[PDB]
Every structure is written in C-alpha cells, then in structure tokens.
Amino acid sequence: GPGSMSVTIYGIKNCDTMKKARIWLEDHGIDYTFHDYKKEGLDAETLDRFLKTVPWEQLLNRAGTTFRKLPEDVRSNVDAASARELMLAQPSMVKRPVLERDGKLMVGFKPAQYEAYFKL
C-alpha cells in the first residue's frame, strides 16, 4: 500500500499542539509536511487565499490572548478588514495546526477527539 501523494501541515514551531499533531500523525503512519507561517511566507496573496477558504471567525483563535488583546467593543465589532490585517500582521495567532489538501484547508483537532472519532 504505497502512497505517491502526501499531506502538508501548516502552523508554527513555538507551540505544543503542533508537536502533538506531527507526533500523532507520524505515529499513525502518515507523512505530514511541517510548514511554518514564516517558512511558507505570509503575504497578501496567501492571506486572501486563506480568508477565502475559511471564515475569519474560524481563522484565528478567540479563546487566547490575541482576542483578549482588543477591548470589549472591538472584540464584538470584529470585521473582515481588521481580521485580515491581524493575520497578515501577526499570523502567529492563526488557528493551528492546519491541514492543506487540494486547496481545502482544515483545522486541527484534539487527540482525544481524533482517536474517539477514528476509533471503531
């Protein structure tokens, strides 16, 4: 059971989740390409492509410090423009891990869930 194709994963290096993802996938016997937000090169084109693939609401963590950074008014008055600027300016907050396959982008899932799901 060979495999010509391969799965590519995007994210950062300064994160525990990322490590858990690469390890889990690696253990399962799947090859995942580790790509850093800065490694791939974040630009206007990339940002647009991402924002077009997924909603800005589900593109950046909200239960973190990034979202807590802005006030109550802004936190509730979030717009596409602001979001896009936040991703292009500080993509390190972008959701992760991230799976890229045929363009379609997917958000990383927890270990307990992934197992409980894939489990028979």
Side-chain angles (χ1 to χ4, degrees), residues 2 38 47 67 72-74 78 80-82 102 109 115:
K38 260 269 271 279
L47 216 297
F67 186 91
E72 269 204 66
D73 207 33
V74 178
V78 57
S82 317
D102 206 20
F109 296 120
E115 305 250 33

mmCIF file of all heavy atoms in Angstrom, residues 2 38 47 67 72-74 78 80-82 102 109 115:
data_model
loop_
_atom_site.group_PDB
_atom_site.id
_atom_site.type_symbol
_atom_site.label_atom_id
_atom_site.label_comp_id
_atom_site.label_asym_id
_atom_site.label_seq_id
_atom_site.Cartn_x
_atom_site.Cartn_y
_atom_site.Cartn_z
ATOM 1 N N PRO A 2 1.426 1.587 -1.162
ATOM 2 C CA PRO A 2 2.271 2.774 -1.318
ATOM 3 C C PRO A 2 1.468 4.069 -1.246
ATOM 4 O O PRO A 2 0.254 4.048 -1.049
ATOM 5 C CB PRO A 2 2.878 2.598 -2.713
ATOM 6 C CG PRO A 2 1.903 1.740 -3.444
ATOM 7 C CD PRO A 2 1.308 0.820 -2.415
ATOM 8 N N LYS A 38 5.954 31.559 8.728
ATOM 9 C CA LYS A 38 7.002 32.396 8.157
ATOM 10 C C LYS A 38 7.796 31.632 7.103
ATOM 11 O O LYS A 38 8.307 32.218 6.148
ATOM 12 C CB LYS A 38 7.941 32.894 9.258
ATOM 13 C CG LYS A 38 7.651 34.315 9.709
ATOM 14 C CD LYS A 38 8.454 35.328 8.909
ATOM 15 C CE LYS A 38 9.808 35.596 9.549
ATOM 16 N NZ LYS A 38 9.708 36.574 10.668
ATOM 17 N N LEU A 47 -2.799 35.344 2.487
ATOM 18 C CA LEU A 47 -3.843 35.756 3.418
ATOM 19 C C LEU A 47 -5.218 35.682 2.761
ATOM 20 O O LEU A 47 -6.149 35.093 3.311
ATOM 21 C CB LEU A 47 -3.579 37.178 3.915
ATOM 22 C CG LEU A 47 -3.949 37.458 5.372
ATOM 23 C CD1 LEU A 47 -5.445 37.295 5.584
ATOM 24 C CD2 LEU A 47 -3.172 36.541 6.306
ATOM 25 N N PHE A 67 -7.271 37.547 21.028
ATOM 26 C CA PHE A 67 -8.626 38.083 21.049
ATOM 27 C C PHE A 67 -8.845 38.959 22.280
ATOM 28 O O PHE A 67 -9.544 39.970 22.219
ATOM 29 C CB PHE A 67 -9.649 36.946 21.029
ATOM 30 C CG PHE A 67 -11.069 37.419 20.911
ATOM 31 C CD1 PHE A 67 -11.663 37.563 19.667
ATOM 32 C CD2 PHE A 67 -11.810 37.720 22.043
ATOM 33 C CE1 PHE A 67 -12.971 37.998 19.555
ATOM 34 C CE2 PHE A 67 -13.118 38.154 21.935
ATOM 35 C CZ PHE A 67 -13.699 38.295 20.691
ATOM 36 N N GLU A 72 -13.670 45.334 24.635
ATOM 37 C CA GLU A 72 -14.961 44.662 24.538
ATOM 38 C C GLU A 72 -15.716 45.113 23.291
ATOM 39 O O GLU A 72 -16.405 44.320 22.649
ATOM 40 C CB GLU A 72 -15.802 44.940 25.786
ATOM 41 C CG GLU A 72 -15.607 43.917 26.891
ATOM 42 C CD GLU A 72 -16.796 43.839 27.829
ATOM 43 O OE1 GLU A 72 -17.880 43.410 27.378
ATOM 44 O OE2 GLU A 72 -16.643 44.205 29.013
ATOM 45 N N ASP A 73 -15.582 46.392 22.955
ATOM 46 C CA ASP A 73 -16.251 46.949 21.786
ATOM 47 C C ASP A 73 -15.708 46.330 20.502
ATOM 48 O O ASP A 73 -16.469 45.850 19.661
ATOM 49 C CB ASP A 73 -16.075 48.468 21.747
ATOM 50 C CG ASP A 73 -17.208 49.164 21.018
ATOM 51 O OD1 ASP A 73 -18.351 48.666 21.087
ATOM 52 O OD2 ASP A 73 -16.951 50.207 20.380
ATOM 53 N N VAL A 74 -14.387 46.342 20.357
ATOM 54 C CA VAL A 74 -13.742 45.781 19.176
ATOM 55 C C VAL A 74 -13.935 44.270 19.110
ATOM 56 O O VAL A 74 -14.253 43.720 18.056
ATOM 57 C CB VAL A 74 -12.235 46.097 19.157
ATOM 58 C CG1 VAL A 74 -11.570 45.454 17.948
ATOM 59 C CG2 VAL A 74 -12.005 47.600 19.166
ATOM 60 N N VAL A 78 -15.809 42.956 15.421
ATOM 61 C CA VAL A 78 -14.797 42.405 14.525
ATOM 62 C C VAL A 78 -15.270 42.442 13.076
ATOM 63 O O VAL A 78 -16.427 42.143 12.782
ATOM 64 C CB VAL A 78 -14.442 40.955 14.903
ATOM 65 C CG1 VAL A 78 -15.688 40.082 14.898
ATOM 66 C CG2 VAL A 78 -13.390 40.401 13.955
ATOM 67 N N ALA A 80 -13.986 41.863 8.668
ATOM 68 C CA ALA A 80 -13.078 41.163 7.768
ATOM 69 C C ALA A 80 -11.763 41.919 7.617
ATOM 70 O O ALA A 80 -10.685 41.337 7.740
ATOM 71 C CB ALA A 80 -13.733 40.964 6.408
ATOM 72 N N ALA A 81 -11.858 43.217 7.351
ATOM 73 C CA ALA A 81 -10.675 44.053 7.187
ATOM 74 C C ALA A 81 -9.719 43.888 8.363
ATOM 75 O O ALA A 81 -8.560 43.513 8.185
ATOM 76 C CB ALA A 81 -11.077 45.512 7.030
ATOM 77 N N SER A 82 -10.211 44.173 9.564
ATOM 78 C CA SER A 82 -9.399 44.060 10.770
ATOM 79 C C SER A 82 -8.774 42.673 10.876
ATOM 80 O O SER A 82 -7.564 42.537 11.059
ATOM 81 C CB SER A 82 -10.246 44.347 12.010
ATOM 82 O OG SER A 82 -11.087 45.471 11.806
ATOM 83 N N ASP A 102 -5.400 19.719 -1.537
ATOM 84 C CA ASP A 102 -6.112 20.123 -2.744
ATOM 85 C C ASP A 102 -6.720 21.512 -2.577
ATOM 86 O O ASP A 102 -7.770 21.813 -3.144
ATOM 87 C CB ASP A 102 -7.206 19.110 -3.081
ATOM 88 C CG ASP A 102 -7.547 19.094 -4.558
ATOM 89 O OD1 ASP A 102 -6.712 19.554 -5.364
ATOM 90 O OD2 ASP A 102 -8.649 18.622 -4.908
ATOM 91 N N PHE A 109 -7.548 19.087 15.111
ATOM 92 C CA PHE A 109 -8.474 18.560 16.106
ATOM 93 C C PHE A 109 -7.719 17.966 17.292
ATOM 94 O O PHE A 109 -6.559 17.569 17.169
ATOM 95 C CB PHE A 109 -9.378 17.496 15.480
ATOM 96 C CG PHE A 109 -10.275 18.033 14.400
ATOM 97 C CD1 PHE A 109 -10.198 17.538 13.109
ATOM 98 C CD2 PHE A 109 -11.194 19.031 14.677
ATOM 99 C CE1 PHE A 109 -11.022 18.028 12.113
ATOM 100 C CE2 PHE A 109 -12.020 19.525 13.686
ATOM 101 C CZ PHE A 109 -11.934 19.024 12.402
ATOM 102 N N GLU A 115 -8.996 10.380 18.121
ATOM 103 C CA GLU A 115 -8.962 8.954 18.426
ATOM 104 C C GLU A 115 -10.375 8.402 18.597
ATOM 105 O O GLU A 115 -10.733 7.391 17.992
ATOM 106 C CB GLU A 115 -8.147 8.702 19.696
ATOM 107 C CG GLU A 115 -6.739 9.268 19.639
ATOM 108 C CD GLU A 115 -5.678 8.187 19.565
ATOM 109 O OE1 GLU A 115 -5.951 7.127 18.964
ATOM 110 O OE2 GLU A 115 -4.574 8.402 20.107
#
